[PDB]
Design a protein around this ligand. Sequence first.
Ligand SMILES: CS(=O)(=O)Cc1cccc(Nc2nccc(Oc3ccc(NC(=O)C4(C(=O)Nc5ccc(F)cc5)CC4)cc3F)n2)c1
Length: 290
Amino acid sequence: HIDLSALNPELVQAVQHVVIGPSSLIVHFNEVIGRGHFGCVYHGTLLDNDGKKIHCAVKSLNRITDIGEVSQFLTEGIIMKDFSHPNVLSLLGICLRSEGSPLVVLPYMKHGDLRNFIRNETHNPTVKDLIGFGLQVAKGMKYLASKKFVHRDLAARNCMLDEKFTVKVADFGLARDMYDKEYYSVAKLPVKWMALESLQTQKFTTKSDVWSFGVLLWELMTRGAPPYPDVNTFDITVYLLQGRRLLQPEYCPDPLYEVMLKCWHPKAEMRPSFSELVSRISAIFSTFIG
Ligand SMILES: CS(=O)(=O)Cc1cccc(Nc2nccc(Oc3ccc(NC(=O)C4(C(=O)Nc5ccc(F)cc5)CC4)cc3F)n2)c1
């Protein structure tokens, strides 16, 4: 029971271009992927016009009483419609119902988020595999940067992994508190992934995404260790300003660590572009047999 008339008409227009009729979507309410303060995600089945069943994730708000929340929720989904790249999560559509929250419907990602995948001891990715995941993230980010899209929360916890081990850059947005909320510090900011200038100004750019990408590479090379295990409540800005960076992981190749240090250049202007990152990491990846 949202009132579409109260929303920005341009937003409603965009939503209608990706509408899923409620009868085409079955939400498995008993099968919850996650729950947070603002939202929740369920398994779902989407029927296409030919009757083919598609396994999907279905994201919902917990409340629909605040127009800002409803508008932001729909806007987050609509933003994704503008993305078409193998390493960027795509939108299946948005289901508007006569009762309750609109539903944002995403393709199902078998292996969940990249951080949970690499931390899972039942999986055994090689150093080459892990570098490959990093390369895929860089390609997704190269695409997004070309669209002048600034991510603001790039981290392994926000990237998804499908059944073919394709990494999809994503962002849980309003449902980000479902998992790993403790990495957010009071604005809720992912301080251990943020560039020095962003810690100081709370402004983000593609060059600050590059810093976060460096941290993501470190996550990959440590199979999902928390960054800066030396610091919990100690101010990360002060820590960095003492002249410190994350240490080189034991199995991180020297040139990949050099890439990380470049991503953390004190001058944003001097950090490599995602184009440069894709080129450099492709070369490093290519040196591994397995
Ligand atoms: C992640 S986990 O390991 O902790 C839990 C788990 C375990 C096993 C399987 C899964 N499968 C799964 N498949 C598809 C989606 C999904 O959850 C979502 C993953 C991402 C989102 N994304 C979004 O809501 C948005 C988004 O991703 N935007 C966005 C922003 C920038 C981009 F570059 C791309 C997309 C619109 C805000 C929404 C979701 F419901 N979850 C999930």
